């Protein structure tokens, strides 16, 4: 990651194991989703603890946990500069069960019932 453009935020993800990964990310991305992404492969559908634990994915904005999945922009990051973060994951399984269960999140999709 060389030269951080004004549309992107340079983010360093530090994992609990003491491994530090740094990549250029978008301020609209969520630190905990990124944490799973920086660990290895892209998160599919909330890599939590198997019997369900959402609080196991949290983000530390060095000294303080801002939230469990709050975005870099929301952490207050000037774009074009390097930001370091500490990420915590607990009892997390790499890929929950591989569903990739998501919502449509796309206009054109979602067939709702009509009557008019």
Residue 103 belongs to a domain: no
Residue 39 belongs to a domain: yes
Q: Are 108 and 36 in contact (CB under 8 A)?
A: no
Method by which the model was determined = NMR
Sheet holding 82-89, edge to edge: 20-25, 9-14, 82-89, 57-60, 65-67
Identify the domain containing residue 8 by its residue range.
1-96
CA-to-CA distance for 16 and 52, rounded, in angstroms? 20
Q: Compute CA 67 distance to the chain's CA centroid, rounded to the nearest angstrom.
A: 11
Indicate which CATH number applies to the domain containing 89: 3.10.20.90
Residue 113 belongs to a domain: no
For the chain, the domain total comes to 1
Residue 13 burial (C-beta neighbours within 10 Å; 0-12, 13-18, 19+): buried
Residue 91 belongs to a domain: yes
Q: What is the largest CA-CA distance in the chain?
A: 59
Residue 77 belongs to a domain: yes
């Amino acid at each position: 990651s060389s030269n951080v453009p004004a549309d992107m935020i340079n983010l360093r993800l530090i994992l609990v194991s003491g491994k530090t990964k740094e990549f250029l990310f978008s301020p609209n991305d969520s630190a905990s989703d990124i944490a799973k992404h920086v660990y290895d492969n892209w998160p599919m559908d909330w890599e939590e603890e198997q019997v369900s634990s959402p609080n196991i994915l949290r983000l530390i904005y060095q000294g303080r946990f801002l939230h469990g999945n709050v975005t870099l922009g929301a952490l207050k990051l000037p774009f074009g500069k390097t930001t370091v973060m500490h990420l915590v994951a607990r009892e997390t399984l790499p890929e929950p069960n591989s569903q990739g269960q998501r919502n449509r999140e796309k206009t054109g999709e979602s067939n709702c019932c009509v009557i008019l």
